[PDB]
């Protein structure tokens, strides 16, 4: 069987190693608190092992255990279901002696997170990938020994590797690593062959397509989506008899903490919610009238600091006491609060919000509608005492009965506060203490006035003109502008402040403020928004004006030079190659290319080388103060070319075999090109012209002087530099004469003098700029003894 043991409800190991040993429990049905093991050493904690615990429902908590590793304590634990979290997490290992985590069977943490911290002897934790393990990738792990780089890298082997933060790194023991399953397998798991496990399984399967753990429910001896027997703890099903037996037993046992289980929706849930009634088959039926919840609290006050505190009020509709929201975590944590508290209706006590950084809005109170039975100090039934930004005011009715605080809310605007004051029904019964006096909307003013008239763009300059708006009293310090590149309008901006133009006494003949942001990149797009600054009047607060963010794109110009080589594929055929330029300055319409031929070396054609061997507000306000004093006093009342597009290569044919060729390349983005780009090459020649035309004939004079007769080829890239002549006596070695154009001119052909008497045969070979060609037919000559 896949479940060789029963439940082990609510284990908690504390003080000495005494107790514990309570074995074979594959499922826990509760949490696991092994902590305060103040006196042990790895000798005391090396042989003890519980290899057959596979399923932990709520969380596993360890706090200051002389323990080397958990790889022997829990070698085959796979999933922490995390239905009931500790603070916000399901795996909290906090604060001395250790070797490594182990736990090479753990696969999935359904709901929760991991919070390993302050373990002064812990490393090998950054070498684990949580993407395939944790539902929520946003896992607070700090203040461990791996932070100071005192622990060298060790991995078994050989082991897989993933990419974290753009770095492809291997993924937690000295003998085991992560068991990566295919993405199509999801949480079902995989075998050694990569076969996906059956869908209802969870983490691992003994055999493919049939399970160590169940994804949704267990039933009996298998994994199912939902039990069809006529639900317990969101993970399994039991018969009605067991549920009613527990219900009767715990009320018979009088044990504190039990919930008298009542069947509802074929689930053995603790109690019927607000809307149904408990019971003779104990099926929760809808109430014959209003049935509230009224979840009483400790002294009528509770702190909603995290998920574990919110779960204390799940299903509640009425709070018999007060509530304070004190979330002090970096992660926003918005979804869980909506589920846990969204079903609330009214707070009979007072409400308070303090240091709720994670909150951005306050919408999770989706049904909070109505009391002032209890008041904060100073007789207040509400409170707000650095990231709050948005209730959504609509037909959604929120009114207070009695009571009357908005302080230190930098991201909260004044308009929403005033609208809340109005809709609350507090009109005519509020004082200035109730209204906000501390910084509200310091960076989130959100001016209620809108601001553009004339837009003109250029490749380096952009002109924007917008309608002039004056405050009620002609206070306006000026306009500061923000604009930055927006490649895809997916919106850090530049900051320039401009004083307003001179005031015009006639509104018709006003001067529209304008600006030029010069020196901008051509073809680039940007996002612009502008703002207004006014002097602060405490009793006459004025927001100013705002302009919507707009996106414009610069005009294009000439591109840059492409960044070029040419390689020949055939004797008369060459293939061009180059890379795109550094900056296109706009999508390149076409790459204009030319081809050109370059002459050879004229000197080498004939020459012989045959030799061998507040700062400004007070300044402006002082100016407004004076003019008021003045008026109050002095006014007493009564070459061939081609275009390439989207290709970094080309082929040119019909060229000489070895003569160098020149290519001129232009990059153009309008059909406007760049400056010239040039490149040359030298193709592989042909040996047809390297061979001397016509065989060699011989003539003999009286003085044993030999003259040879052949024709000069002038095809191989022009004049031939020289010839090579070979001759050998009968039965002797070989002799050579290096014949150049100069010697050919002197002797009107190759001539041999001073040779020893005997019989010879002489051959002639041409040598062009390419090299030495084929040899000619031999001819003979004789020298008299």
């Amino acid at each position: 069987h896949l479940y060789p043991g029963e439940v082990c409800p609510g284990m908690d190991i504390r003080n000495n190693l005494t107790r514990l040993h309570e074995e074979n429990c594959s499922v826990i049905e509760g949490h696991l608190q092994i902590l305060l093991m103040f006196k042990t050493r790895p000798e005391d904690f090396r042989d003890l092992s519980f290899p057959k615990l596979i399923m932990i429902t709520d969380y596993l908590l360890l706090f200051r255990v002389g323990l080397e590793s958990l790889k022997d304590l829990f070698p085959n634990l796979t999933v922490i279901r995390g239905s009931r979290l500790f603070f916000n997490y399901a795996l909290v290992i906090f604060e001395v002696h250790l070797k490594e985590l182990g736990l090479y069977n753990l696969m999935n943490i359904t709901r929760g997170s991991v919070r390993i911290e302050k373990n002064n002897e812990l490393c090998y934790l950054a070498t684990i990938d949580w993407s395939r393990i944790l539902d929520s990738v946003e896992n607070y792990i700090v203040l461990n020994k791996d932070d100071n780089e005192e622990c060298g890298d060790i991995c078994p082997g050989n082991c897989p590797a993933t990419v974290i933060n753009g770095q492809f790194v291997e993924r937690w023991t000295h003998s085991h690593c992560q068991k990566v399953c295919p993405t199509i397998c999801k949480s079902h798991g995989c075998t050694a062959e990569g076969l996906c496990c059956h869908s209802e399984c969870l983490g691992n399967c003994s055999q493919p397509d049939d399970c160590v753990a169940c994804r949704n429910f267990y039933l009996d001896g298998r994994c199912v989506e939902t039990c069809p027997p006529p639900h317990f703890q969101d993970w399994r099903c039991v018969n009605f008899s067991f549920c009613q037996d527990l219900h009767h037993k715990c009320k018979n046992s009088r044990r504190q903490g039990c919930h008298q289980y009542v069947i509802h929706n074929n689930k053995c849930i603790p109690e019927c919610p607000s809307g149904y009634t408990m019971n003779s088959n104990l099926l929760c039926t809808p109430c014959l009238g209003p049935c509230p919840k009224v979840c009483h609290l400790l002294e009528g006050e509770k702190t909603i600091d995290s998920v574990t505190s919110a779960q204390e009020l799940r299903g509640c509709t009425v709070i018999n006491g007060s509530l304070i929201i004190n979330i002090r975590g970096g992660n926003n944590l918005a979804a869980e609060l909506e589920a846990n508290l969204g079903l609330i209706e009214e707070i009979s006590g007072y409400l308070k919000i303090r240091r709720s950084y994670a909150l951005v809005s306050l919408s999770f109170f989706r049904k909070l509608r109505l009391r002032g039975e209890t008041l904060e100090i100073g007789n207040y039934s509400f409170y707000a005492l650095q990231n709050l930004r948005q209730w959504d005011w609509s037909k959604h009715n929120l009114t207070i009965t009695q009571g009357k605080f908005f302080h230190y809310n930098p991201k909260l605007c004044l308009s929403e506060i005033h609208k809340m004051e109005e809709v609350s029904g507090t009109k005519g019964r509020q004082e200035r203490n109730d209204i906000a006096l501390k910084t509200n909307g310091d960076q989130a003013s959100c001016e209620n006035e809108l601001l553009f008239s004339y837009i003109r763009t250029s490749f380096d300059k952009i002109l924007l003109r917008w309608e002039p708006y004056w405050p009620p009293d002609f206070d306006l310090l000026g306009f500061m502008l923000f604009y930055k590149e927006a490649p895809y309008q997916n919106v850090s901006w530049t900051v320039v402040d401009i004083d307003p133009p001179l005031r015009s006494n006639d509104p018709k003949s006003q001067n529209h403020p304008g600006w030029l942001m010069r020196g901008l990149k051509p073809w680039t797009q940007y996002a612009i928004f502008v703002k207004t600054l006014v002097t602060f009047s405490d009793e006459r607060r004025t927001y100013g004006a705002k302009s919507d963010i707009i996106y414009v794109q610069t005009d294009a110009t000439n591109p840059s030079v492409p960044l070029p080589i040419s390689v020949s594929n055939s004797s008369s055929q060459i293939i061009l190659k180059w890379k795109p330029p550094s900056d296109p300055n706009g999508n390149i319409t076409h790459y204009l290319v030319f081809w050109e031929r370059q002459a050879e070396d004229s000197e080498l054609f004939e020459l012989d080388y045959c030799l061998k061997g507040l700062k400004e507000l007070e300044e402006s306000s002082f100016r407004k103060t004076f003019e008021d004093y003045l008026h109050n006093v002095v006014f007493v009342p009564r070459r061939p070319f081609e275009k390439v597009v989207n290709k970094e290569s080309l082929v040119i044919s019909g060229l000489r075999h070895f003569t160098g060729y020149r290519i001129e390349l232009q990059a153009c983005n309008q059909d406007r090109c760049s400056v010239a780009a040039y490149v040359s090459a030298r193709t592989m020649p042909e040996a047809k012209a390297d061979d001397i035309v016509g065989p060699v004939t011989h003539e003999i004079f009286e003085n044993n002087v030999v003259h040879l007769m052949w024709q000069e080829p002038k095809e191989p890239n022009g004049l031939i530099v020289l010839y090579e002549v070979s001759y050998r006596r009968y039965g002797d070695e070989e002799l050579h004469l290096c014949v150049s154009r100069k010697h050919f001119a002197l002797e009107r052909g190759c001539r041999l003098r001073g040779l020893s008497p005997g019989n010879y045969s002489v051959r002639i070979r041409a040598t062009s700029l390419a090299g030495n060609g084929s040899w000619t037919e031999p001819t003979y000559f004789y020298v008299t003894d």
Binding site: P472, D473, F474, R503, N505, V636, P637
Partner: protein, 46 residues
């Protein structure tokens, strides 16, 4: 408009009364921080 604030009053008072100018033997608190009226504005210019 009629929100004669700041340098607007000096430029607008001679479009109200200039025959006798302005009487001599306040103004900002009642026609600069709010809206003044022709019933009360001409007093400040005799």
């Amino acid at each position: 408009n009629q929100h004669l604030c700041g340098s607007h009053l000096v430029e607008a008072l001679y479009l109200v009364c200039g025959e006798r100018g302005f009487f001599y033997t306040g103004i900002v608190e009642q026609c600069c921080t709010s809206i003044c009226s022709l019933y009360q504005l001409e007093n400040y210019c005799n």
